[PDB]
Write a protein that binds this ligand. Structure first.
Ligand SMILES: CCCCCCCCO[C@H]1O[C@H](CO)[C@@H](O)[C@H](O)[C@H]1O
Ligand SMILES: CCCCCCCCO[C@H]1O[C@H](CO)[C@@H](O)[C@H](O)[C@H]1O
Ligand SMILES: CCCCCCCCO[C@H]1O[C@H](CO)[C@@H](O)[C@H](O)[C@H]1O
Ligand SMILES: [Hg+2]
Ligand SMILES: [Hg+2]
Ligand SMILES: [Hg+2]
Ligand SMILES: [Hg+2]
Ligand SMILES: [Hg+2]
Ligand SMILES: [Hg+2]
Lengths: 411, 411, 411
């Protein structure tokens, strides 16, 4: 199914180059890279909760103690003190709170990894879809330009006839109005082409000088040959975020249980900075502490409610993502299955209108039909030719819609 | 005005069932439920600030004191100590800071309650609007299919005539081009119908198998029979959020004032863990503390500026919501008042075009008018019939727009 | 180039008044003001990190000390204690962490200042663009109303003719269908005009009574006469945010280095509240402390990774903004350069169609051409006249697009 570099299947080295440029260096690329690195840093920070912490502390203080407060034998006046210690703290994690925190953070990272794939897909498909439109525009340009050549040929026939007393000025004027209108349409298409090149340049992270070297597409379209949702990075990301939320419910539950910590220090403390290192002025301690909240008035309880709510939200978000992915795939299937008959009937309208015009103009070049018959046929032909070109372009768009709906093929 | 289950007024048990399904269980539903529960948990957490807090603390420590630091008679060497205490803390709230915090949180909850109603409205109206489009599509299907039957009948008349030397091949070819084009339009409509069923399935939280049982709508539209803004949950929510912001200004102001707290503990402390419970090794304390910031270099001041700014923003947000609600209601009124005359003139175009076609085809079936007169009339008729069906559908859309603009009728 | 009050160049005091109203008082205005004040408050709060902090603390405690814990000569029973102190804290900032924090906050403020300019631009251009559409609608109203007068004149000619046996009922019916359709189009345009007035009222922060005094625009369009990006407030804001992020990388780096603080207090502490102020019960201290983290298990490291990621994101965001601004300017140039030829060819279609109609109707008023020739010409004329009016309106839209792309002229 969809390749990793799936755009290569269209055999357009243009398209290949545009996507390749965007995926090597472009702002959308860099932002996606950055957002993944962010999640990596966040995961790293979270994992620290399961380590011990070590720090060095030192102080020098000039202090005067109250004479009648907490010491029966306080030193007199202002004296200097110093300390210099190595300090240690470790949280025991008896209920798994901190482990759950790390699982939540790593689940977020897994979601971030999936989102980086989704970002690659969003870049490549945004370019391919813009390219599809460029191709559609160039097709409409060819169709309208060819019609213009004909409209001009009709004016000049009708003018030669009018000159020889074989046609009216009304017909001539109408034909000139038709030709001017078709040319106006062509100019609009040509503007759109250039606008679309500008957009492609921006999509690949470049200024508008990149647009100057964009040429007519040459796309080769080949027919291809619930279980279909496993390459959807959005579903994967939402899965992992629902896992992270579940873990956060666990954290909130574990906050009701005793927290057991271990602290320690070792170093020197002295009355007199010049005595900091004297024999006997070492100090140290180690021991566990436990804290058990007994009544918080709603803090622990409310936090648990909020964590449950976030889990429920995340599950609903996952469900929504599944529903939306199935909708997207269902639509691609619907439209893909409808396309051939649409094209078929529109081809038939083109061909019958082309016959109509051929007969109308033969008859005109021989004085049996009016100019009006020609105008009506010309208009019907052009309208159907444009409809056809747009449906042919739709085949490419639908192939791209399938690739998007399947989530690409990054692997 | 708008009922609680307002969609029932259209007398389409289909529509009723789709909305009912979505409101019983669907991802959009669940996310809305979850976001309300979240606000409930947040409110619960906030209310804790006005309670006292109670906790149990215990520790066992092996400690060596410096010989010449803070004790004139320090114990020698490394000794074991233990503590086990019940701890209590209460913030007095003399300036109402904490009360304002709870008012802010409960105001947010009231806003969240209003937003849950808005979410129900967004679900039901999104479904009804998608349904409106489904109905419009089925109407265009009937209109275009009926026209197709006629186009085919015209081909086969013109072919019988051409066969008998009474018509040209040009006419025949044009008529076939017209019929193929009308059929191509029909196929496009039929695709849209299926796409719209897919969308309805997704809107009610279901996979695309739900779409398979969606049938043609049968909507019954009945005419109905600043003060009109009280069912707007968005205005209510913004109201309450502006209240919450106002309270937060109060909090920021109160941070300049003295904070008075009460702390207490009771328990046991001992040199020697085996002596933890000995007579005389109980320890306890109670008392108030007061802290008054005297200079913070911009922390309190900046926090007040930020809180005032948030209030101003929230008031502007409320004002914007009022303006937008009035715009929405004004537009519904504008369009509702315009609709009948639009329909009237478009009905007149339909009927006159239908007469034109009838005369053109009678005249054709008797050799007085061209095929061209028939083509022009057929085209004019179909264009006007589609315009009419779209305006008739607009009546339903406008009724739904009114319900949305009034904020529904949940009560 | 673009003035500060650039809309004045269109010489429409209407437009001037609408924009002026919105910029004096409107919800969008107020929200923008509020968001700037917020950033000001945040900057103020951040700057506090470089000041010292002063506070007053007092306590009164009833306390019972354990007999055999930490004092060899503990007081007996429950006794009262009091304290009353002035407390001082100052962070030294040897590595520039706190300075970087303030630079980051002031850079955010500079970005907020730029965004307030962008908000002014978004307000004025949203109004001008809505006004452009209002003008376009009024032009289409004039064009369609004038065509309607003609369509009605054609019905009544064809009816007088049909009455005298000189025309068919088919022609009459077709002409009536055409007129009804043109009137239906007019009614739709008139609805749109009123909807557009409603939108303008909302855009200037007013209820729908403001819409009642909005009249036909009278815009005067005058031709004007990478380096072009310096008035883009979005680029400026993104610049400053990338600076703020860079500083935050510095903060994260500086967190690995020793933190040196200074603390002090002075006051009174006493056993016996009635002795709080007794000679010798003063207490005080001053001194520096240093903390150096030695191992944090990923906290410092992960924070640095996250800060680098945010910098990278912000740089990419800046780059994206540059690319998007260049795209916007490139499009304005593309479309501006295309416009004249589009208008020219469309003017030619109008004029030739107008000749066609004139000849068709002269010939009709003299029995040489059919009604059909008239219908075809009338339709072609109207279609081209509307296309022209829309292209003329486009000239105004493009001028506004240029002003937007250049970022206005606030100075
Ligand atoms: C990473 C280094 C950790 C060890 C720090 C040990 C600090 C205290 O250590 C010391 O202090 C005394 C007072 O001078 C001496 O009497 C000692 O012999 C000595 O062990
Ligand atoms: C919720 C329980 C709160 C009460 C805890 C009281 C702890 C201290 O209580 C005690 O400690 C002493 C030392 O053993 C005794 O001499 C006592 O008679 C006793 O009151
Ligand atoms: C802003 C005011 C700062 C100064 C506070 C000084 C508090 C301690 O000050 C004092 O305490 C004693 C005990 O009564 C006396 O013996 C003193 O003479 C006196 O200096
Ligand atoms: Hg990057
Ligand atoms: Hg990069
Ligand atoms: Hg739920
Ligand atoms: Hg649910
Ligand atoms: Hg404001
Ligand atoms: Hg304001």
């Amino acid at each position: 199914w969809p390749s990793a570099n799936w755009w290569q299947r269209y055999q357009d080295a243009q398209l290949n180059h545009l996507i390749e440029e965007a995926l090597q260096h472009s702002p959308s690329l860099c932002m996606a890279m950055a957002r993944l690195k962010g999640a990596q840093g966040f995961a790293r920070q979270a994992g620290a909760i399961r380590s011990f912490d070590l720090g060095l502390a030192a102080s020098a203080t000039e202090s005067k103690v109250s004479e009648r407060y907490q010491s029966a034998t306080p030193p007199d006046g202002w004296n200097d003190y110093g300390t210099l210690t190595l300090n240690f703290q470790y949280d025991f994690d008896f209920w798994g709170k901190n482990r759950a925190a790390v699982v939540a953070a790593t689940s977020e990272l897994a979601a971030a990894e999936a989102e980086s794939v989704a970002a690659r897909l969003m870049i490549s498909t945004s370019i391919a879809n813009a390219y599809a439109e460029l191709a559609r525009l160039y097709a409409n340009q060819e169709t309208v330009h060819a019609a213009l050549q004909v409209r001009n040929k009709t004016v000049e026939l009708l003018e030669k006839r009018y000159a020889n007393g074989l046609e009216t000025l009304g017909s001539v004027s109408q034909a000139k109005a038709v030709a001017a209108s078709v040319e106006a349409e062509l100019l609009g298409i040509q503007e759109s082409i250039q606008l679309q090149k500008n957009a492609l340049a921006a999509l690949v992270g470049q200024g508008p000088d990149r647009a100057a070297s964009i040429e007519e597409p040459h796309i080769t379209l080949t027919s291809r040959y619930v279980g279909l949702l496993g390459h959807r990075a959005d579903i994967t990301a939402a899965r992992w975020r629902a896992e992270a939320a579940a873990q956060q419910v666990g954290i909130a539950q574990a906050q009701f249980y005793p927290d057991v910590t271990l602290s320690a220090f070792i170093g020197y403390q002295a009355f007199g900075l010049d005595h900091l290192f004297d024999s006997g002025n070492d100090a140290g301690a180690i021991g566990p502490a436990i804290y058990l909240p007994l009544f918080t008035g709603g803090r622990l309880e409310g936090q648990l409610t909020s964590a449950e709510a976030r889990y429920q939200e995340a599950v609903a978000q996952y469900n929504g993502t599944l529903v939306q992915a199935l909708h997207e795939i269902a639509d691609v299937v619907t439209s893909s299955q409808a396309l051939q008959a649409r094209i078929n009937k529109t081809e038939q309208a083109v061909q019958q209108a082309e016959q109509a015009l051929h007969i109308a103009t033969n008859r005109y070049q021989g004085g049996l039909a009016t100019y009006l018959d020609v105008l009506v046929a010309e208009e019907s032909l052009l309208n159907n030719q444009r409809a056809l070109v747009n449906l042919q372009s739709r085949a490419f768009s639908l192939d791209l819609a399938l690739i998007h709906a399947l989530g690409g093929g990054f692997e």
